[PDB]
């Protein structure tokens, strides 16, 4: 099963955005290094656009799940790796409880040694009173469940989960993620049974850093099979 | 042609709505003249951001080098255009170009002294290393030239560089002597990450030694709260475990996710590892940002062996 | 009993001509004083074995061409007039150990610079690339001279030790030749790093750099005694002063001494002699010709002591004192061909310095 020996050690991680929410046009580079064999992202990402018109924790989804670890014995139902050096396109429609939704698309391919994740981003219907333009989400994140599933149309998987997204008057924001991964190679991919992954996620800020920046260290891993 | 005479001219002379129109007109972007000077060159070493931002979106050769071998960063860097620079690099600019006289960009911003230009391409990766024709390094630029500050800076980039690359790589003899040039073993680049970090992680024992006794900060943290400690419980090493115990390495200290040594060595497999942390004072009690004992990781990545000596609490 | 002197027309010969006319009066020998056109390529064949003009007025660098068929004559004065003179501007018409003429003016380049812009000049090459900035800041730049001509360029290249031939005791030794020296080496890098570093431009040639500094475009310029009638012409409140120091040594631009030989075949030449010792070559003969047209700086310091006066004409004279003769030989020609094509190459980067200069050296038949 080759494709996954790409991903015994560690692999160099960049990223690279350009989307609009509202008009409010923005790009973000995101630099750092993954390893599949922990499922740990070792990340920061810098806004070259200057400020953020939204809050950096609504995109950390939209920031490689091919880096989730995978257990010995579901290494048949990883999809990600499967996929590679070819790649995978992944596309998202955030729906953001009571304010607006994100639409996006990305292609999470290898560019030489490294992997890279070109994203483009659409955002709209958000509420300037809302949460997001209000930059009232807190700088933090919550662990959560990505359940896999297969599309048998679409020769690719369905993935669909929540996201919690705290709130400092003490609420929540949810974000329902709706999204489609299809393989950009011609060849065989392993489309896998129905499971989930589980997410662990902090968010921190470097100190000798003066642009809007976001670090996040990130640890995924696969369940769901014996 | 003419309208590449035209663009040209339209770059030295600033006229930013001149060369809009000049672009719709589909003027060749890389036209260059005798001299090989393209738009992209001229508008660096005249200071004018706008224009380049416009040249960079029709695709100008950010590389493209005139018949001496300078590029647009060398201007950009030259004559203290700290804007164009940093667009410059932005768009993929060869940070260690060299001229027809191996001169980089480094070599000339420190002649002049620039330090926030010289910052900002030490951070993208400048060769301070690189020689010229006449064997000196921007550090001996910077002294004949009288920038004795940058030249301390220059020979601090060069050294940590160079340090984290020997650890990284496992030369013992390297990291020995680099100490007895300076180098400051607590040097951290802009990850965080010390010579300790990556000689725990890559499994050097012997280089994690040296460090250590040249005082190398064993509680270290990396952007994302990690410790040599950390790094080696994930990577399995185990006499480095033991050794930066030793010496004081925090058995409790958290990431940023508020995983501890413990947590993480129950996330990898290391039986061996999570006997000496507990020996050493581990609190297998301690949970994560999430609530989860090393314990709990144990069982969800299905390794009980782990999980029963953690039983044992 | 006939004088018939030759000297070119922007010279002041109507000048001349009163002294000539104020001779006529004191010895009965007519002088002529014409004018005619081409005298310098017709001279050497038409009075070889003819009648030709008893003195001639023209650059040393000829006479050298001349003195090599023998057609000028040796000319012996004593030591009590060799000491009115300034010692180097006998080297000028100095030959095989042999002097040739009388060295009447002195011209060489100097550092010309608007006080408007710019009321201190620098002293030494190195400040130019610093105060280029401070002036680009304001539209403007710094320096700007003709680059096509190793004329101009040559005082920096050879500040450093560079030199075309050798000069000892009246003799240049034709097969060692100073282009390639770490001297001209130094310097030439340089020019090229201010062209590299777009403080000038390669392209740049003598009427640009004149119309340049003349509008004020530029704050500096190098040029000769001859531009400052145009210069004044223009307006701008110029000055004069020492070309700056490069490496410590002071920049060596090539001297043209304007000097006057005797012709062999002339039956009056002992009188004629005198007319140029007693006559010419004072305070009342050279200010007459100095009304006509001006000489700038002049051999005989009575006479230049109150020129110095003047700063400009003063300035010329101390780069003089420190600028290199230029070698009346005729592998000059070849000299010149083999630096022009070697400064235009390194300049519009055609080649590197080094195999240029090295490529320049041997056109000039010199060994590295």
């Keep these: ?226 | 042609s003419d309208l590449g005479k035209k663009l040209l001219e339209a770059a030295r002379a600033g006229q930013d709505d001149e060369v809009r129109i000049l672009m719709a007109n589909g003027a060749d972007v890389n036209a260059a003249d005798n001299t090989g000077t393209t738009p992209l060159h001229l508008a660096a070493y005249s200071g004018h951001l706008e224009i380049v931002e416009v040249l960079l979106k029709h695709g100008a050769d950010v590389d493209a080098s005139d018949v001496f071998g300078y590029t647009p960063l060398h201007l950009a860097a030259y004559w203290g255009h700290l804007e164009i620079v940093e667009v410059l690099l932005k768009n993929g600019a060869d940070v260690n170009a060299m001229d027809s006289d191996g001169m980089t960009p480094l070599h000339l911003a420190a002649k002049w002294g620039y330090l926030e230009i010289v910052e900002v391409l030490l951070k993208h990766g400048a060769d301070v290393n690189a020689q010229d024709k006449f064997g000196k390094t921007p550090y001996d630029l910077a002294t004949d030239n009288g920038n004795q500050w940058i030249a301390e800076l220059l020979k601090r980039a060069a050294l940590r560089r160079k340090l984290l690359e020997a650890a990284r790589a496992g030369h013992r003899d390297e990291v020995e002597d680099l100490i007895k040039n300076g180098a400051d073993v607590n040097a951290a680049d802009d990850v965080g990450v010390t010579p300790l970090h990556l000689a725990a992680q890559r499994g050097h024992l012997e280089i994690v030694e040296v460090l250590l006794k040249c005082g190398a900060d064993v509680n270290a943290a990396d952007l994302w709260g990690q410790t040599p400690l950390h790094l080696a419980a994930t990577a399995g090493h185990l006499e480095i475990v033991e050794v930066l115990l030793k010496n004081g390495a925090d058995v409790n200290a958290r990431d940023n996710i508020g995983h501890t040594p413990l947590h993480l060595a129950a996330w990898a497999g290391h039986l061996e590892i999570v006997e000496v942390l507990l020996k050493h004072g581990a609190d297998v009690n301690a949970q994560d940002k999430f609530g989860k004992t090393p314990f709990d990781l144990a069982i969800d990545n299905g390794n009980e062996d782990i999980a029963e000596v953690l039983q044992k609490a | ?368």
């Design chain 3, 1 to 368: 009993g006939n004088l018939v002197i030759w000297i070119n027309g922007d010279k002041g010969y109507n000048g001349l001509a009163e002294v000539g006319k104020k001779f006529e009066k004191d010895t009965g020998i007519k002088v002529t004083v014409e004018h005619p056109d081409k005298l310098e390529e017709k001279f050497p064949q038409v009075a070889a074995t003819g009648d030709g003009p008893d003195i001639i007025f023209w650059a040393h660098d000829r006479f050298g061409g001349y003195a090599q068929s023998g057609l000028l004559a040796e000319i012996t004065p004593d030591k009590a007039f060799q000491d009115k003179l300034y010692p180097f501007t006998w080297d000028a018409v100095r030959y095989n150990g042999k002097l040739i003429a009388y060295p009447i003016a002195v011209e060489a380049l100097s550092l010309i610079y608007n006080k408007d812009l710019l009321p201190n000049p620098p002293k030494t090459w190195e400040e130019i690339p610093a105060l280029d900035k401070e002036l680009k800041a304001k539209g403007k730049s710094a320096l700007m001279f003709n680059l096509q001509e190793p004329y101009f360029t040559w005082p920096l290249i050879a500040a450093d030790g560079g030199y075309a031939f050798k000069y000892e005791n009246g003799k240049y030794d034709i097969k060692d030749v100073g282009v390639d020296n770490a001297g001209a080496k130094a310097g030439l890098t340089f020019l090229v790093d201010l062209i590299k570093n777009k403080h000038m431009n390669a392209d740049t040639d003598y009427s640009i750099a004149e119309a340049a500094f003349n509008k004020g475009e530029t704050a500096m310029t190098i040029n000769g005694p001859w531009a400052w009638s145009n210069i004044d012409t223009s307006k701008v409140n110029y000055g004069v002063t020492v070309l700056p120091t490069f490496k410590g040594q002071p920049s060596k631009p090539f001297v043209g001494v304007l000097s006057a030989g005797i012709n062999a075949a002339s039956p009056n030449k002992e009188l004629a002699k005198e007319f140029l010792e007693n006559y010419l070559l004072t305070d009342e003969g050279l200010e007459a010709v100095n009304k006509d047209k001006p000489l700038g700086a002049v051999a005989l310091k009575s006479y230049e002591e109150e020129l110095a006066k003047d700063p400009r004409i003063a300035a010329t004279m101390e780069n003089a004192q420190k600028g290199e003769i230029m070698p009346n030989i005729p592998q000059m020609s070849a000299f010149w061909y083999a630096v022009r094509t070697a400064v235009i190459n390194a300049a519009s980067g055609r080649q590197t310095v080094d195999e240029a200069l090295k490529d320049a050296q041997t056109g000039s038949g010199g060994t590295p």
């Design chain 1, 1 to 226: 099963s080759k494709g996954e020996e790409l991903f015994t050690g560690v692999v160099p991680i960049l990223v690279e955005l350009d989307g609009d929410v509202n008009g409010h046009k923005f790009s973000v580079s995101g630099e750092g290094e993954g390893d599949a064999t922990y499922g740990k992202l070792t990340l920061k990402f810098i806004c070259t656009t200057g400020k953020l018109p939204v809050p950096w924790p609504t995109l950390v989804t939209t920031f490689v799940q091919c880096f989730s670890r995978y257990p010995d014995h579901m290494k048949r139902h990883d999809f990600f790796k499967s996929a590679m050096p070819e790649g995978y396109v992944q596309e998202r429609t955030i729906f953001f409880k009571d304010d607006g939704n994100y639409k996006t698309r990305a292609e999470v391919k290898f560019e030489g040694d490294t992997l890279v994740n070109r994203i483009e981003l659409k955002g709209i219907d958000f509420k300037e009173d809302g949460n997001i333009l209000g930059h009232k989400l807190e700088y933090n994140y919550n662990s959560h469940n990505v359940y896999i599933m297969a599309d048998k149309q679409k020769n690719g998987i369905k993935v669909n989960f929540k996201i919690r997204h705290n709130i400092e008057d003490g609420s929540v924001q949810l974000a329902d993620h709706y999204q489609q991964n299809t393989p950009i190679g011609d060849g065989p991919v392993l489309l896998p049974d129905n499971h989930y992954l589980s997410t662990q996620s902090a968010l921190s800020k470097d100190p000798n850093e003066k642009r809007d920046h976001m670090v996040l260290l990130e640890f995924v891993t696969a369940a769901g099979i014996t």
